[PDB]
Write a protein that binds this DNA or RNA. Structure first.
Ligand code: OZ1
Ligand code: OZ1
Ligand code: MG
Ligand code: MG
Ligand code: MG
Ligand code: MG
Ligand code: ZN
Ligand code: ZN
Ligand code: ZN
Ligand code: ZN
Lengths: 66, 261, 47, 242, 261, 47, 66, 242
DNA sequence: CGGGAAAATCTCTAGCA
DNA sequence: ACTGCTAGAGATTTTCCCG
DNA sequence: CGGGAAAATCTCTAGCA
DNA sequence: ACTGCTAGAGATTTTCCCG
């Protein structure tokens, strides 16, 4: 009953940015969402983004895949 | 060398040579000539070639007053989505700004307002309205519009759309609301291929859904983690990495240097 | 410690040096002549 | 996919779920589950209601999202067609307004409001709006003493109604309810767009007769033929237009 | 599809949707929605995201008038080297500009002068001075300062150096000539690690030396080349490639598809 | 042949279409209403 | 007597630019110099640059090598 | 390199060329050829001359590069120290002026000219300048009728003298001669900078005694020991400072 | 697997006082 | 202790679509 | 061949009306 | 048919310098 909510929270995509890179990195996989940080998985790399550097969406072109 | 240091300092006090000129003319290494330049107070005239990055949390809006046709348009943008609201106000005062902000806070979940240091936004009236609605005011650095770089850009885009619909309306406020319609619902692009209205609905619904999902996950999972140290809190585990939080610092460890309880 | 030369308020004249109270991602907080100022890092040089 | 489709269709034969439950439970694409729920014979978010209420000798335009109870009220200087059309243009630019249901007054049947509703693409129609009017007037009577003008009190009551009053099933506010309803409508519109995108493709598989396309992946092609859903590999299938 | 084309055109005449919005809302491919946008005259509001590249031949200078302390400084730059000349002139007229330009043409080999469309440079007086000295005038596109992007940049740099030496001089013209000294001889960098004076001497001496060397090479080498065609002129040959010139087009061929006579 | 929409002379108002007489590296020469103008390619869109 | 002048003309270095690249390419080797074009050799590639896009210098830090 | 050094030194023993001919002929670095020409016992571009000439009741400052004949003349409004210092600051910012040779007049011995020459780093000293003055006055008398003011005629004569009069050995103008002379001076200064850069290195080779460094390549190190020049490989050599 | 075709992504600019 | 961005235009790279 | 050290190169910005 | 650039500040990559 727990694993379904974890797979549900990994269905959300994150568009994030690094510290001196002005370009938005692509849709990562939301692993964890906190009050001040967001743990993502981008290109098999587990990153910790600040909350102020991430845009988390459930892209509603999920009606093809995901 | 050292004679070159003395002569190079004495000529930098005249000509203000750069490090390359003093390194060539006085046989100095680049470290010494760079130190001769870096000690002159008159030569520090350039800053860092970087830009910052604005806050794009789901609750922060950016507000600015722009001017068109002798009238004042107060514009707000949702920074995470690009959703704008805009209204032609009769004057650029604190009463009109506080009314616009209380109205916007009643419409959407506004948690933070980022403005420049315009008198409209700096007033006690907007301060009382943000205190009533529970909004946090975050003023930018004075005379630095790049801190408001979202809303200023949206000012540009808003004026562009007004120039495409100005002949469709008799008054300016009608053209402003028509441009707000066109930006929020008739322009697509950005991170999801969305319009700004679809994107703000996705941002806010995702914030609600992920907040309640993480509240349901955190309530069940209670696993004390000993990494490499002390007892942390487990945030996530998947098959090769474990993300934890020990003393308010969120860290990632491999399955080596980890053990969960 | 650090010397900060900065660009304050619609003035092309650079000024300093000042003490670096806080270096952040994007901006700095400095103290020049017991005046605490927040400067963007584009308008500041730290030595 | 071949595991999930038979499970979902027999589950629909069992107790007739909708396609969202099937797309969540059996990892189906929503078009496949939509075709599962659409092959059984036995198996609103853009409607707003507008009125003008009168309080303290002034006129308040009130627009209620009927599906949510979300409210947008505004003190207008006159109950005319120009102010109504300006309020409607603001509302249509703020939210996805598809139909506006009014009470056949004099300011809602204006040529100005008709031109505004034509421009924004809104249909006009002539115990939800007066219930919300009474609840909003109750909040205005509560927080009138915290403001000097009636405009401020109306916007304060709209804030309190949309975000500080929680009721219903799960104890949500009207703002959370409207963003859930509009997100569900965006999902429904994207699904209908994708279904409309793939209905003009006919496939030939293994040949055999023409079948409808439902899903085209990176290795598999999910088709529907003779009202049963099959999964063929991509190279055994020819997808053409019609 | 085609019904979508009709409805998308009729909504683009209202809302001026971009191609992404009409491609999503009316099931159009990107080609059709892009053609609906590209036919609206009201939607062509952005140019090409490029920049040009100024002429940097060894004979072209770029001139501009800048203003400092209520006085006018006429500045010229050698575009290939960055060597500047500058003078505080009493007025921004054509007589002072023609005097400055005749003086500069007497000092250095000036072959082309590139200016903006200031009245100083557009006058008949500067036109007669450039006719006398044999200089070609190349005015930029009006109200486009990027065409003069070298000299405008040098204006910036010149003012910077004046702000470092303004307390060393009592008059502005002394500080201007001190800054010209410091730029031409006390600042090093750029393509050879040179100062601007060393670089202009290298540019012009290289132009003289390579011109006379190529005149000596071209006089000896006379080899008719048949490539792949007709008789070309041999420009260069080295061990795997042959550079030729047939009908004023300089081409490079390999040793395959070539034969020299 | 080609349509050119351009930005002429300290005016934010874009105007056109015009015939493309000459496309160069960096700028274009166009003809709008029998007026031959030279526009930078940053201030011109060619279709 | 001819080859010495060819090796002399190849001692000059060219800093050139391409059509839409704003950055200056490094010191190529001057093979040929014309009235309107310049034939260079950069990274074992024979290029033809316009005259208005090239800066030809004999870098006087030739007192180490070349 | 080992082929070239013995050839160049025996060629210097034969007919005593300078280092530029050796660095061109035998593909030597200029420091090695400079040490070849510097081990034989038996083996100006910054000097300008200033004067004031008087013509049509006006004063013309004339500065001649002595090595080239290149001229810079300017009609000044007064024969004072301020105008002389302004002319000298312009000339020093335009060309590499190292020494200025004047005629011990009243405007060349001023405190203002002394301060200007101190700032720009110019030494002052008290049949070249009057020869060029007579030639320049001849050109001014030629082209006076093509101008209205005397300033224009002086700048026209300076143009004609520097670029339209060709004489000397190869038939060059004064502008070509001054850019050749200043390019040769830049080469001489860069060579002296590199020699000064490597004189504080001593090397130990194959050990054996301390030798002077002349050239350090990517595989070879050229040294000089006991007044003969050797070439050792890099790994057989230890280069240290002293 | 392989060439065009098409989509996606990268690069870069003006304008926002 | 706070912070450039956005959308469009063209170039370029990646993916697709059947052979 | 290999780690620091240093040099060279890449990236990016303001200011030039 | 004409055209953004320049110099400095910091980051990053390449070369050097002996073990
Ligand atoms: N200069 C203002 C701009 C402005 O220059 N934009 C252009 C602009 C320039 C660069 C950029 F990167 C983004 C931009 F947009 C702008 O857009 N707005 O809104 C402003 N609003 C208020 C005040 C006055 C500040 C009050 C005094 C503070 C005392 O502490 C100034 C401005
Ligand atoms: N605007 C002028 C600027 C100028 O904006 N610089 C700033 C500037 C801006 C952007 C840039 F990328 C480089 C720059 F430098 C400048 O520098 N100079 O010199 C000018 N000189 C003369 C005239 C007036 C033109 C006469 C009317 C033409 C009628 O046909 C205008 C200007
Ligand atoms: Mg503002
Ligand atoms: Mg603004
Ligand atoms: Mg100008
Ligand atoms: Mg200018
Ligand atoms: Zn200094
Ligand atoms: Zn059923
Ligand atoms: Zn349009
Ligand atoms: Zn000798």
């Amino acid at each position: 009953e727990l694993q379904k909510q974890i797979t549900k929270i990994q269905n959300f995509r994150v568009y994030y940015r690094d510290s001196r890179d002005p370009v938005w990195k692509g849709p990562a996989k939301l692993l964890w969402k906190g009050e001040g940080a967001v743990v993502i998985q981008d290109n098999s790399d587990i990153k910790v983004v600040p909350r102020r550097k991430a845009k988390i969406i459930r892209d509603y072109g999920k009606q093809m895949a995901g | 060398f050292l004679d070159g240091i003395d002569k190079a300092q004495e000529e930098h006090e005249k000509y203000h040579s750069n490090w390359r000129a003093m390194a060539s003319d006085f046989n100095l290494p680049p470290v010494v000539a760079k130190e001769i330049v870096a000690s002159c107070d008159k030569c520090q005239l350039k800053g860092e070639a970087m830009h910052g990055q604005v806050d794009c949390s789901p609750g922060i809006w950016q507000l600015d007053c722009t001017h068109l046709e002798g009238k004042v348009i107060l514009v707000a943008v949702h920074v995470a989505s690009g959703y704008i609201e805009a209204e032609v106000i009769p004057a650029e005062t604190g009463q009109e700004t506080a009314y616009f902000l209380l109205k916007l806070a009643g419409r959407w979940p506004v948690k933070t307002v980022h403005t420049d240091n315009g008198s409209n936004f700096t007033s006690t009236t907007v301060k009382a309205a943000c205190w009533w609605a529970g909004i946090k005011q975050e003023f930018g650095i004075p005379y630095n519009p790049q801190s408001q770089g979202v809303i200023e850009s949206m000012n540009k885009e808003l004026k562009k759309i007004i120039g495409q619909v100005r002949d469709q309306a008799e008054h300016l406020k009608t053209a402003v609301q028509m441009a707000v319609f066109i930006h929020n619902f008739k322009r697509k692009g950005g991170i999801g291929g969305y319009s700004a209205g679809e994107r703000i609905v996705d941002i806010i619904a995702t914030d609600i859904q992920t907040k309640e999902l993480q509240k349901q996950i955190t309530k069940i999972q209670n696993f004390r983690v000993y990494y490499r140290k002390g007892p942390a809190k487990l945030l996530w585990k998947g098959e090769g990495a474990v993300v934890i939080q020990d003393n308010s610092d969120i860290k990632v460890v491999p399955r080596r240097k980890a053990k969960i309880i | 410690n650090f010397r900060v030369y900065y660009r304050d308020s619609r003035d092309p004249v650079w000024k300093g040096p000042a003490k670096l109270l806080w270096k952040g991602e994007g901006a700095v907080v400095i103290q020049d002549n017991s005046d605490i100022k927040v400067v963007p890092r584009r308008k500041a040089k730290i030595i």
